[PDB]
Curated annotation (Swiss-Prot):
Site annotation Lowers pKa of C-terminal Cys of second active site: residues: 103
Function field: Participates in the folding of proteins containing disulfide bonds, may be involved in glycosylation, prolyl hydroxylation and triglyceride transfer.
Residues carrying the site annotation Contributes to redox potential value: 38-39
Disulfide partners: 37-40
Domain of life: Eukaryota
Location of this fragment in the whole protein: 354 to 469 of 505
Organism from which the protein derives: Humicola insolens
Compartment(s) where it occurs, according to its Swiss-Prot or TrEMBL record: Endoplasmic reticulum lumen
UniProt protein name: Protein disulfide-isomerase
Length: 121
């Protein structure tokens, strides 16, 4: 099946992230998690749900839910806890927005609306 070809699930590698995140034309949300994390294993499935929901909404060309593991190369991302969330707003990018702690997609969407201009006003 698609499993991403539709848009919800998107790949973000060291050689790609720089592009999507730097893209001011559209907003991008790259989340760093791990399978063996234990507390992040849920972040994966939780991202797949919000991805298909937000993707179906009327913001396909406004915000894109991108997932990625925090075990890649050329990725200078120092964080306290694995469940790290990097916010990159379209137009006001250039600064990696590091969250304080994940738990539910509901908190992610809300925040993006407070920090992201595309999901605000």
């Amino acid at each position: 099946g698609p499993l991403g070809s539709e848009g919800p699930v998107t790949v973000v590698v060291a050689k790609n992230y720089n592009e999507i995140v730097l893209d001011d034309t559209k907003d991008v949300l790259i989340e760093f998690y791990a399978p063996w994390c234990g507390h992040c294993k849920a972040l994966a499935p939780k991202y797949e749900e919000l991805g298909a929901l937000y993707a179906k909404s009327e913001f396909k060309d406004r915000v894109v839910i991108a997932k990625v593991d925090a075990t890649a190369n050329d990725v200078p991302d120092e964080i306290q806890g694995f469940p790290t969330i990097k916010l990159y707003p379209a137009g006001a990018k250039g600064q990696p927005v590091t969250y304080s702690g994940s738990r539910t997609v509901e908190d992610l969407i809300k925040f993006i609306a407070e920090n992201g201009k595309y999901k605000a006003a």
